[PDB]
Design a protein around this nucleic acid. Structure first.
Ligand SMILES: [Mg+2]
Ligand SMILES: [Mg+2]
Ligand SMILES: [Mg+2]
Ligand SMILES: [Mg+2]
Ligand SMILES: [Mg+2]
Ligand SMILES: [Mg+2]
Ligand SMILES: [Mg+2]
Ligand SMILES: [Mg+2]
Ligand SMILES: [Mg+2]
Ligand SMILES: [Mg+2]
Ligand SMILES: [Mg+2]
Ligand SMILES: [Mg+2]
Ligand SMILES: [Mg+2]
Ligand SMILES: [Mg+2]
Ligand SMILES: [Mg+2]
Ligand SMILES: [Mg+2]
Ligand SMILES: [Mg+2]
Ligand SMILES: [Mg+2]
Ligand SMILES: [Mg+2]
Ligand SMILES: [Mg+2]
Ligand SMILES: [Mg+2]
Ligand SMILES: [Mg+2]
Ligand SMILES: [Mg+2]
Ligand SMILES: [Mg+2]
Ligand SMILES: [Mg+2]
Ligand SMILES: [Mg+2]
Ligand SMILES: [Mg+2]
Ligand SMILES: [Mg+2]
Ligand SMILES: [Mg+2]
Ligand SMILES: [Mg+2]
Ligand SMILES: [Mg+2]
Ligand SMILES: [Mg+2]
Ligand SMILES: [Mg+2]
Ligand SMILES: [Mg+2]
Ligand SMILES: [Mg+2]
Ligand SMILES: [Mg+2]
Ligand SMILES: [Mg+2]
Ligand SMILES: [Mg+2]
Ligand SMILES: [Mg+2]
Ligand SMILES: [Mg+2]
Ligand SMILES: [Mg+2]
Ligand SMILES: [Mg+2]
Ligand SMILES: [Mg+2]
Ligand SMILES: [Mg+2]
Ligand SMILES: [Mg+2]
Ligand SMILES: [Mg+2]
Ligand SMILES: [Mg+2]
Ligand SMILES: [Mg+2]
Ligand SMILES: [Mg+2]
Ligand SMILES: [Mg+2]
Lengths: 193, 51, 148, 99, 203
RNA sequence: UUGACAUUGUGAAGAGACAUAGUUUC
RNA sequence: GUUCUUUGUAAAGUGCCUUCGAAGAGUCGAGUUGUUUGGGAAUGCAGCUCUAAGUGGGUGGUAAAUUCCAUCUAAAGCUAA
RNA sequence: UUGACCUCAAAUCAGGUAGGAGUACCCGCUGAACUUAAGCAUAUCAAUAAGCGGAGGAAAAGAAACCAACCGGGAUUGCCUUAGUAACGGCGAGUGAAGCGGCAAAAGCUCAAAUUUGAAAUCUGGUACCUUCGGUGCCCGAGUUGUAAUUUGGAGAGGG
């Protein structure tokens, strides 16, 4: 069972695999139901939108932090700054997250601003009865898109102090690479009687 | 779990539908296809929006 | 489709094109990669030298991402400027106003130096640079600005 | 911290204007408290030392802190608890059969 | 309050006062039947923190289970098989003695639902437990919004399904890298990673 | 089958160390 | 949508100052055995022996000692899609 | 002599509940061998079949003793991907997940540990009536070895 100049393969089919084969034959089916569900809900939910107001948030890890993507909810801080309490903010269709923390003031302002805008651009019907029919915007997401912030300008002057960048990296890499040892030569030379 | 549906490159799908549209002029083509269009004015046959 | 296949053509021939002597039996060589060090060693060395045994060190829980770092060569570079904007900057090669290219924003990690950009000044923002790429960049009056 | 602003090196990372968030109480889950402190002290002097706890202090008087630790590190989980347990024992000793 | 003291006291199991107690009590229990009703918590503070309440509807049972390994049943040790499978005697049983305790009382009081259970004592032969139970059809429980969840049918015999605390433990239901195999619930998560997912427009 | 640990507690004589007060161990 | 009882000397939200801030044990953890896992000086599970603490405790995918750092808050509980 | 209390019994005691079935899908237990390795014992088949206990229209899981190591994310579930990869492996045959990213759906919370102590404020049941999935009066009973109100870490409580 080995011949020719073929690539070595790894087709894992030695369990009773024909026993667990899902064919999404219901791909069209679900889409429709999925769609119907949204429509039933959209109606049931009176004039509210189908979603909640999510916050801006910088993405995790070395790879995606360049981007900014919708988060879960607004942090007790942001909510507070934007002039309301969570208990309420939860009834006004704002998502709140007790877990998330503020450490970056650029994002915190962003989010607070986001809340401000949302607040002004909604209208909250009174508890009474009247229900002054006012037409539903379905999305909150569409309405208040999240965008990537502007990090610089298009053109600008070239300032070259002359220090290679490359070399700064090599040096920087280096400094960390020996950071320990030199603290031992600082401990060992400190014990110079 | 046999293959039922086929994937065509979206672009080529359009090359085809485009091609298809273009032949609906070309009266001999139309003619050839069944379709009794001898005794019609011109092709493409265009008709009032009131339709 | 069945109709184009060579079994349709074998109907009426005794052995389906599998020989009268050597037959078509279940698994003559063994199954799968059986015997790779024995009766299938000749095919394994040649075609697949290097297969058996170990080299290098194990890395438990290696998460790629940690190592994310796409490269862009100077080679292209200028491609990261939209064409309309591009020609505008080529002509009027200058300090005072020179284009800023966030190569991190283009989703690159490091700039390498494949070959010749014009003599236009560029401000190049990147996480990493090959010694040469940066050299060549300065040689047109650009600088590299180190970001994250 | 403060990040260097570059992508390797010691304080590797993006410069950003910082914030330091209001603190989470769930971060003081360890914390003593006057109530528990009192109760634990009181319970201690009701029930007193236990078998391995006696041996530990008799070990302390008669062989030192280092063998007390070694033994205790077998008794308890580990060397760290053992540190903690021998300490706790010294303070039973000094506070009591001394000052 | 008193509870805080009992709590702190119980943590001194090898204390002259607590081992007097433990020894007297373990003898008392061992005389009674292996399943038997308990008049009250012997640990009113433990019970209490595990959801117990001193109102009609709540029931305590004390129960005795044998300690040690699972001797694999098999006549004369004979395993009839490959030899990784030849073991009989060092074999452990995936559920804990606490589960077996809850299970045998829960069966003994099918009209109850098991809520929780705590250890009380052991010797060489037995681990002794006290299972706290609730009566889902007693109106003191059907009212009371806090405990009437227990009245739904989805919670029939939670002890038999690994749904009590001991259950979820050995089921390996926790978040984290250490619980990848078993956490959305092991068998279900195997099925997932061994299902072939074929689309209409094949990927 | 043999050992250790756990179930395992109370005296008394005798050995055993801080090194010939008695907490501890056979 | 309407209509009747006003539930109240009831209930709840928010700002500043001060003192506090109770938070699950034969469990966490450890040794050993066995089973399992991609989990590698040991992924989970169980048996038996040991068995905690409270500026504590768990985790941080290579054992150990030392010093830091980060990150949650276990050993009790409900919940639609 | 009489009355309690603790603990244990009895009744065709007043009212209830459990069993059996079905078992496609769901939660656990227990558990093979054929097979593959061209032989075979580890391995593989497979944490599969058979056997056992227990649910529902879904079950389970779920508001972090999480992921991360970033400019950090933020309950759970599933899809696309990560990836036939990290890793395991007579390092042979074979095996083999997760973090990030897009998406579907979205939702949050409850106790324990607190002196109501100027008033157990709470609750099953019997009973009479009523506007009966319930309410009110009254009476036995539960309950202080703790039934309510209050608070759940995001906090929160007591003073001012
Ligand atoms: Mg497969
Ligand atoms: Mg096979
Ligand atoms: Mg189907
Ligand atoms: Mg939505
Ligand atoms: Mg209204
Ligand atoms: Mg074909
Ligand atoms: Mg055909
Ligand atoms: Mg033909
Ligand atoms: Mg021919
Ligand atoms: Mg032919
Ligand atoms: Mg023929
Ligand atoms: Mg021929
Ligand atoms: Mg042929
Ligand atoms: Mg033939
Ligand atoms: Mg021949
Ligand atoms: Mg190999
Ligand atoms: Mg190139
Ligand atoms: Mg009672
Ligand atoms: Mg067998
Ligand atoms: Mg084995
Ligand atoms: Mg696995
Ligand atoms: Mg294909
Ligand atoms: Mg003996
Ligand atoms: Mg015994
Ligand atoms: Mg807790
Ligand atoms: Mg097993
Ligand atoms: Mg193991
Ligand atoms: Mg360490
Ligand atoms: Mg509860
Ligand atoms: Mg649940
Ligand atoms: Mg009756
Ligand atoms: Mg049944
Ligand atoms: Mg098996
Ligand atoms: Mg077969
Ligand atoms: Mg074979
Ligand atoms: Mg063969
Ligand atoms: Mg054979
Ligand atoms: Mg196996
Ligand atoms: Mg089966
Ligand atoms: Mg049903
Ligand atoms: Mg339901
Ligand atoms: Mg559904
Ligand atoms: Mg559920
Ligand atoms: Mg929480
Ligand atoms: Mg964080
Ligand atoms: Mg998540
Ligand atoms: Mg291989
Ligand atoms: Mg496997
Ligand atoms: Mg997402
Ligand atoms: Mg809710």
């Amino acid at each position: 069972a080995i011949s020719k100049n073929l690539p070595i393969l790894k087709n894992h089919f030695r369990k009773h695999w024909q026993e667990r084969v899902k064919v999404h034959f219901d791909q069209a089916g679900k889409k429709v139901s999925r769609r119907n569900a949204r429509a039933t809900r959209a109606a049931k939910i009176a004039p509210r939108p189908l979603d909640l107001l999510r916050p801006v948030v910088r993405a995790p890890t070395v790879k995606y932090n360049r981007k900014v993507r919708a988060g879960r909810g607004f942090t007790l801080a942001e909510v507070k700054a934007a002039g309301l309490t969570a208990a309420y903010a939860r009834t006004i269709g704002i998502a709140v997250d007790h877990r998330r923390q503020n450490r970056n003031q650029e994002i915190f302002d962003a989010n607070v601003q986001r809340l401000k805008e949302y607040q002004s651009k909604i209208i909250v019907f009174p508890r009474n009865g009247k229900a002054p029919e006012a037409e539903q915007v379905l999305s909150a997401a569409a309405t208040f898109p999240i965008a990537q912030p502007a990090t610089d300008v298009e053109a600008r002057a070239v300032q070259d102090n002359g220090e290679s960048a490359f070399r700064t990296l090599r040096l920087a890499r280096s400094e960390k690479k020996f950071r320990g040892i030199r603290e031992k030569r600082a401990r060992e030379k400190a014990e110079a009687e | 779990w046999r293959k039922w549906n086929v994937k065509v490159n979206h672009n080529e799908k359009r090359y085809a539908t485009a091609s298809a549209i273009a032949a609906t002029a070309v009266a001999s083509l139309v003619l050839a296809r069944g379709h009794r269009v001898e005794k019609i004015p011109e092709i493409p046959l265009v008709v009032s929006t009131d339709l | 489709p069945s109709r184009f296949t060579k079994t349709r053509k074998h109907r009426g021939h005794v052995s389906a094109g599998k020989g009268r002597i050597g037959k078509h039996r279940k698994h003559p060589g063994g199954r799968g990669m059986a015997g790779g060090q024995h009766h299938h060693r000749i095919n394994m060395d040649k075609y697949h030298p290097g297969y058996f045994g170990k080299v290098g060190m194990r890395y438990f829980h290696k998460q790629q991402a940690h190592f994310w770092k796409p490269v862009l060569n100077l080679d292209k570079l200028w491609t990261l400027i939209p064409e309309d904007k591009r020609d505008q900057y080529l002509k009027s090669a200058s300090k005072e106003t020179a284009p800023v290219i966030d190569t991190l924003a283009a989703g690159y990690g490091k700039i390498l130096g494949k070959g010749r950009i014009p003599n236009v000044p560029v401000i190049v923002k990147a996480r990493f640079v090959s010694k040469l790429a940066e050299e060549k960049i300065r040689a047109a009056g650009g600088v590299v600005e180190l970001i994250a | 911290t403060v990040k260097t602003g570059i992508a390797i090196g010691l304080n590797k990372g993006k410069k950003v204007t910082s914030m330091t968030p209001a603190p989470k109480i769930s971060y003081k889950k360890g914390a003593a408290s006057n109530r528990t402190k009192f109760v634990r002290s009181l319970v201690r002097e009701i029930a007193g030392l236990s078998p391995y706890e006696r041996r530990l202090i008799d070990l302390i008087r008669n062989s030192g802190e280092k063998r007390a630790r070694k033994v205790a590190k077998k008794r308890l989980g580990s060397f760290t608890r053992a540190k903690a347990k021998v300490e706790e024992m010294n303070n039973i000793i000094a506070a009591s059969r001394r000052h | 309050g008193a509870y805080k003291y009992l709590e702190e006291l119980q943590r001194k199991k090898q204390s002259d006062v607590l081992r007097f107690l433990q020894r007297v009590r373990v003898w008392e229990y061992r005389q009674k039947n292996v399943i038997h009703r308990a008049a009250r918590p012997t640990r009113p503070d433990k019970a209490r923190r595990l959801g117990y309440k001193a109102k009609q509807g709540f029931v305590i049972y004390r129960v005795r289970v044998r300690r040690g390994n699972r001797k694999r049943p098999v006549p004369k040790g004979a395993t009839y098989g490959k030899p990784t499978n030849q073991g009989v005697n060092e074999l452990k049983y995936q559920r804990s003695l606490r589960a077996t305790a809850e299970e045998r009382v829960g069966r003994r009081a099918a009209n109850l639902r098991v809520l929780n259970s705590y250890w009380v004592n052991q010797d060489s032969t037995y681990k002794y437990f006290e299972v706290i139970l609730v009566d889902p059809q007693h109106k003191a429980i059907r009212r009371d919004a806090r405990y009437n969840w227990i009245c739904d049918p989805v919670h029939k015999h939670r002890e038999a399904r690994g749904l009590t605390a001991t259950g979820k433990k050995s089921r390996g239901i926790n978040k984290g890298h250490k619980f990848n195999n078993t956490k959305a619930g092991r068998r279900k998560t195997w099925k997932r990673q061994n299902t072939l997912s074929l689309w209409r427009y094949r990927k």
